[model samples]
Target: VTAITKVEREAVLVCELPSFDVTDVEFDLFRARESTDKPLDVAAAIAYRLLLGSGLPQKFGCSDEVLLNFILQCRKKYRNVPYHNFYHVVDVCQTIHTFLYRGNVYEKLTELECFVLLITALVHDLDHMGLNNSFYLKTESPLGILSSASGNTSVLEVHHCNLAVEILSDPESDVFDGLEGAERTLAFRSMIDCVLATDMAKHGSALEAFLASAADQSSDEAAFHRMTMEIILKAGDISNVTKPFDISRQWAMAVTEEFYRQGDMEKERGVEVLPMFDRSKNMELAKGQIGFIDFVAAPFFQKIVDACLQGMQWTVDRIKSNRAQWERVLETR
Candidate 1:
């Protein structure tokens, strides 16, 4: 309950989020993060405000204090890293909110489901240590060995779920506390499912399955909701490419540096590092980003928008714009 210290609470309550509008579908969360001195406090406040304003938490009997506590606890769990930290999760949360509300994905989901999605977004990358699953598997770390021996494909995702359970175990911090029976079960299951779906290892298969499920007009209501939630989270995960150029480039740099750090570690440990990660090669950031847009971001958004999320067509547009910007970077190279 006291996870949020008094000073942190004051920082949230007193400080204004400059140029930040909760209703702006294209609200610049990265700008908001950079503007504030206390990034964690501001992030918690933004998440809390968005949740409270969505009216989902209130509908599910969530109190203001408990919701704040959940955000505080989530903020505490994330490790300081180049990219995968509290700021990244908050970006996911805001991006998913834009997807649901502005992109019209909310029409396909229940209020309780949306509530679960936002909370799950906040917790999705819980305790990430700036290292991907490949590093763990390649190095045969303890958690990696556990994932391999147990046959869990998404090692970090599963670890995040375990941590989510721990945070929710405290009645004082549990956002889903008032839910019961099937509703409670759905919350837990959907949250875990959405978190697990963020694994890049399962990306292609998951998207193919999602598009198939979406294409089927006869799909069950529950199945559609589940798959749509999964797809929404996935879209939110790689959404940096869909943002404004400055924002997208900043994120690209952050992730590139993180990847380089991983490569450095792999070299030290004698693991076979991938080309994108190998620091000695000094991978060109522009070509890597352009390739990501071509091979990953562009197709996923184009197909999903064509299938159902038509309102999100703008994402594909932004991806094109960002791609062009990166091409300019290549020319500069």
Candidate 2:
């Protein structure tokens, strides 16, 4: 028997792209995933469709085949981690797509810049081990040691960037193969910068700088564009709190479980576990979510939306809605 061809694999899995209005900013991708038994299939299909609709690949001399190869390879690199896996990145990609398209933030950037944002969102968490940077550094894992020794404190972000480069090394899978000189340099630097900024350790400062840039009367078009891309991706990363209540609750559970798993590993290794990650803390899920919104999500989204993403006020609205639901969750508890 002949080995299975790419066409055969596509036919078996990702041939029928999910149907949704390309222009509909409020489209529900989680609902799309729920409608299919093959979550990964739909995930890949969603990324493919989003990139195709953007029309950036063709503009930059990349072909559909190369793009698909890149996506598939990136998918394989995501580990079987609960929260930081392929699904999380895909959720982020779709979320950022909604932010750019529905939130009307695309006007601030070029088509090529939009292309990098979407693709970088797809691969930003490549090969994640389901643990946070804190876990790595506190436990002194091998990569963590290397990160400290190298003076790059954002350990996982650097690794993810490295993996993305490796995937793009092959011409068959390189989405930026057609980009040359300054164009290519901008692509790599912008993507890697956004990835590094996703590290939560830098969250406060990053948001501050982005908001400051947004308020600047003088326009360094390039500076503003880069900051916007970075800010939007960060918004998408912690976006669970900005979703509808049920969706927010589900994602909270997934991430909470992942955190508890890390706590279990830390316990086995005799390391101190933070209260949130400590399985013994008995921190009710609802309380944690509400606290996250109060301390983290609500302030970030509200401030950014108020700053320059006024078109995306719905994000702040939804964050408030989810917080209200969590307060109800607390009441019923």
Candidate 3:
């Protein structure tokens, strides 16, 4: 756990994030990245401003200096991947802010829960090497072997949780260090649980569990809150489809390219590669986005919005609009 130095803090503090509202659902992180040469610093600044604006940090006794340190520490761990880069997590954090504040999801969670959710978003995909958990396991990579030995298939999620804990071990970068006793324990537990829940392999089960918990009036309150946080982070993870058409398209391209690169590596390793990842397949971006909307994003958002998160109806609506837009792309082709 390296300490976040004064130099690192200044780099993030220097970015003003001008003309950008970090809490908007339509906020374009791509534009923010292009607006400055030091995109990483700008991304850190975005998280910093978003957290500070939420006023949760101060309420929880987290100072501006410690929060900035936490953001920079997270920024340092993310590699230069196409999709799961620093900008992506910052985008997740921003999207989550919109969900909690704009969509009024905060009403269902306590203030500490809300704060942890926002903080968890930034660390959920730490040190991602642009590969999924399946990639590691299918290839029997060291991390995958370790995960198998541990009896958990969530390779990357576990790795991310490890790094998150490492960053928090230092008081300088520990956002939850301000809390004591059960609150601190809750912060750590909820953060780790939310990160582990991000494993797409558990997507169906996690969604099912959240829906079940939401439906049960007699559900354990703490458990339900934890599941809500998990679902929110998962929602943010796949939220590219919930943005405007152009922005959503851009995110699709980035992720598709990352998948293609993973396929390329798999080929070099003499391992099995899925068609979705194969660069040789030359699949149309529109088809991929359309399939995701129909099979995954659409139903997921529609159900969750209907079940409980009515304030998040815009996500469902945007998925509809984006699907139509993608269909139009297919029509033109």
Candidate 4:
């Protein structure tokens, strides 16, 4: 929430991502990270360039300095974790751009909604410590206790939104500060809603709700728009399998490693660790991805695309393609 100084701004602004289109779904963030000595700055710059390229920030009266400041502020909060770090959000932001613009889902949303989705992507996983909600509850951590007491199970999502609000409280990092009345309120409300919806425990219900809304012609337009934004963010959150094989494998590795670390901690704390998280189980990465495709990614994307978001059929196609590629990996093994 502090002032993002000129020194920090210059650090990011100076990073030139040659040959890397921030708007492309295939954009290689791993390579981008290694390309620079200061990967944090480079990663921040990627988000900065992405937001600016969308021209969404300027459309809502967000100044370039303020946008960059907001990105840097979000970047600083991200922990040095394996998967849920700054790069993951940047990837989500970039992938959502493809969903909206490249996939032509932009027609289903207002400019402000699209803007909110991109901004929410940056703040959605803020300060994640490489653990899930179950981890906290299983360990009886303070956050889990608070969530159980408060009757809300979305432990990390709420924490992310809290930090997002904290960041935006300072005018220097408030991307939504550009709005005045209802537009401003909608921005904050929709951002928080989208972030809350990212928790995977609600994944099935969220998909069903969005599909029902999309199926009903008489559905409330505002509600439909809100759910569309939510679904798009959810899609981005689980989008690794929709990527090219190598990229998808890279992401799987990161997330699996992060899960193993949590499993390590859980063992130290004498809590139950799921087989998927237990590194000693030696789970096949190929089978893990195929299962995710069959149960989660394939069904979710195909349903949403078939129901209303027809422009996003490419996502469905890619998921199928990637699933086959993973099967091939398993076949050779």
Candidate 5:
């Protein structure tokens, strides 16, 4: 909950926070700032405090210690997981918290919606093995089989959500304590729906749905706020694109290294390597990143700001500054 320090920023950029024994949540909050001067880390902490103090029962009905322990345990388990680690979860949480609190938007969110957003952030990537679906595709892993057989990303997400709930249900675990019946079930269901929606492969469908929902709104205020949340969540997921050049490069390297490690595992098992995950097979990392930005991130955010002039101007200026810095870094590289 402390302000992001220079040391933490450097550590995150180098992907060396673990070596310094820093928490993943803290690292992510810091890294997220590399994109903008916004205090998302502070926003997340504020949301946490507000949620706990509001006296609304937790979805899992767990104690404060249990929620803390669950997050800490998750951080410990996959703290070092390349891309999908505790940092990513905290980043999403902080991003959502920030978006929801933006000016008038803060007053619009219902208590249930706020609760759902927080829960979604906390469990977004629970049990992720730091491996993408493409890894399963090439290795023919059981997860890949499950994914294909189910024919929907939601199925895979449901499996993860169910596993997390089961883990929380342990009598000694302290995750869900007070709630017994429908309240717990509703919380669990909403959390699952929101978290499962984070899959990158579902980007197009999700964006279309978001656009439709926003377009259906009768008031400009309602439409703008809806679009803002959609862009905020999407931005949180792919935030590295707008990060400062050096920081962005650091994340890019770490992700590429993880992919390469997966490729090495696939080779050892006599399986083919997925295109992007195969380091030797894919040398144009920056080029691929540019394409990802243009095709995915740019289109998504472009529409959000387009709908609101003030928001768009601020985001665009920040992105332009980031690109200028990144270009300088590229010149030196």
Candidate 6:
């Protein structure tokens, strides 16, 4: 008898395990629903389409059953790691999709733009090693050096985008099942730009400058959409800060743990852990979140609203309500 293939074996293993978290399932469902505007079996279909449309299934050169198995493996492998995990990707995608629809921002964004946003959200942190920028900074890791020395955010993003593209480019992968020529090129470029833009260290200056520009041109519709893109991306990047208190607090704790983990690694390597970004268990927890909002979110959102008053109003209500809830939770604690 022929041996069971590795993908086949893995798929069987996953099926034997208990179900995944409801929150995770919900997030994925939301992304699929938003993208298709239909009620579908989101989990199975999206995993299938991403692999097929992105050409990953072709790269594996596996049968549909085997490809499905491999995609499931990718999901399980990257399941946990706080903010950079599978669920977070789904959350960002769902959040962006919801924000666009709820605010009627869809009329402002092209189909290509919306596709880019969703695709980027899905694959932004693929193969993430669960290490933050500081981890790379203190260790002088290759990724850190390249990100710093290159001094180009788009370049850094391109690197990541290329990685995903390479995986999908494989003949065995099915990521580009139907597209060809310019359609493929445009989709690839759009997804890459959006994904690479997520690198906080690389994009900070440009983003800040964009926000400042929006503040100045706060009156035009075209200028408003430009600012809206920046803020939507920013909100996606930091949406955890505005989550339900218990959920947000959990994220805070996990991030703290990851920070401490990095510090421990640095100590083991005889490298001095960077101050403020260290991994100490007792390090100020809420300080970073609060400061990020005060310094980053506040300014960025302020400019966004200034540029697009109606759009800004909706975001402002959400932000204020979210912040108030967190503050009350803090007081009680």
**Candidate-wise lDDT, in order:** 0.88, 0.84, 0.92, 0.92, 0.55, 0.54
The residue ranges of model 2 lying beyond 4 angstroms of the native Cα positions read 1-30
> Residue by residue across 1-333, what tens digits does model 2's lDDT show?
122249634842444654775345455666766877877767787788778888789999889888888888888788887788877887788888888878888877888889999999998999888788988999999999999999999999999999999888888788999999999999999999899999999999999998898888786878888888899889889988877777777788889889999999999999888898888887698788878889998899888888888778888888888778878878888
Off by over 4 Å in 6: 1-79, 142-159, 171-177, 208-231, 279-284, 312-314, 329-333
**Lowest-sum lDDT 10-residue window in model 3:** 1-10
Give the residue spans of candidate 4 off by over 4 A: none
- Between which residue pairs do clashes occur in model 4? none
Across residues 1-333, which tens digit of lDDT does each residue of candidate 1 receive?
A: 345566666767675676688656567767787786777778888888889879898899888878888888998899989999898888888888899999888998999899999999988999999899999999999999999999996889999999999999898789999999999999999999999999998899889988898899898879889989999999999999999888888899999999999999999999999988877886577888888999999999999999989989899999998898888887887
Model 4 earns a TM-score of: 0.98
Query: With candidate 6 superimposed using the best TM-score fit, by how many Å does residue 38's alpha carbon deviate from the native?
Result: 24
Query: Which candidate do you rate higher for TM-score, 3 or 5?
Result: 3
After TM-score superposition, the amount by which residue 57's alpha carbon in candidate 2 deviates from its true location, in angstroms, is 1.6
Clashes of 6: 22
Any runs in candidate 3 off by more than 4 Å, and if so which? Answer: none
Model 2 lDDT-worst window of ten: 1-10
- Each model's RMSD to truth, in Å? 1.5, 2.7, 0.9, 0.9, 8.3, 7.6
* 76-103: candidate 5 lDDT, tens digit per residue: 3334677676666765665555445432
Candidate ranking under lDDT, highest first, comes to: 4, 3, 1, 2, 5, 6
Q: After superposition, how far is residue 171 of candidate 2 from its true place, in Å?
A: 1.0
Q: Please give the distance, in angstroms, between residue 21's alpha carbon in candidate 5 and its true position after superposition.
A: 19
Per residue, candidate 4 scores C-alpha lDDT tens digits across 65-175 of: 989989989998999999999999999999999999999999999999999999999999999999999999988899999999999999999999999999999998899
Q: All candidates' TM-scores? A: 0.96, 0.93, 0.98, 0.98, 0.69, 0.68
Off by over 4 Å in 1: 1-7
In candidate 3 the C-alpha lDDT for residue 270 amounts to 94
